[PDB]
Ligand binder design. Structure first.
Ligand code: 52J
Ligand code: CA
Ligand code: CL
Length: 166
């Protein structure tokens, strides 16, 4: 099971402001949709409620400590262990955020899909710092910038840096 982080962040790692994206980049979200198709999205409750609805065509799995939290059209998991059990047959899952949710799956992540937006927004939540010498870029692509996607941004994909033995 490939554990993947899916993230869009600005130049200071901002990923949210008041439970919202500080930017409106529809093309970016279309990238996310294409990338995650046929794979579970794992997200915290707050992240889910910020989106406000289930993202169709995907296993939506909400992670919360709250045992009786349910929304229709979604699955609820209360721990990392519960997520792995739910996704036991999944080839790849996408950790969709909640800064806190990223921290939960940090010891397990195998792959990083990071969208980097070349702008500094006002923000109150951040993608956790990561040692990137552990990682290695396998793919990069400049995002579509235009009337509907004002900012400059780049899609990056990283896999684990393989150590060469002494
Ligand atoms: C704070 O609010 C949001 C946060 C995120 C997280 C996120 C964002 N970007 C990256 N790179 N990593 C991420 N982890 C995502 C969304 C928005 C999500 C969303 O509508 N979709 N994404 C999944 C998805 C899956 C199936 C169908 C539609 C969607 C739509 C896109 C359509 C309209 C192309 C969002 O609401 C606007
Ligand atoms: Ca792993
Ligand atoms: Cl969250």
């Amino acid at each position: 099971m490939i554990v993947s982080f899916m993230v869009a962040m600005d130049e200071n790692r901002v990923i949210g402001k008041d439970n919202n994206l500080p930017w409106r980049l529809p093309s970016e979200l279309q990238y996310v949709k294409k990338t995650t198709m046929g794979h579970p999205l794992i997200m915290g409750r707050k992240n889910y409620e910020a989106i406000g609805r289930p993202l169709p065509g995907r296993r939506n799995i909400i992670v919360t400590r709250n045992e009786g939290y349910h929304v229709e059209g979604c699955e609820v998991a209360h721990s990392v262990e519960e997520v792995f059990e739910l996704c036991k047959n999944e080839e790849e899952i996408f950790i969709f955020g909640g800064a806190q949710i990223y921290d939960l799956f940090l010891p397990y992540v195998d792959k990083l899909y990071i969208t980097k937006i070349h702008h500094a927004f006002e923000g109150d939540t951040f993608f956790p710092e990561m040692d990137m010498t552990n990682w290695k870029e396998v793919f990069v692509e400049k995002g579509l910038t235009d009337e509907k996607n004002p900012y400059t941004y780049y899609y990056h994909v990283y896999e684990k840096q393989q150590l060469v033995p002494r």
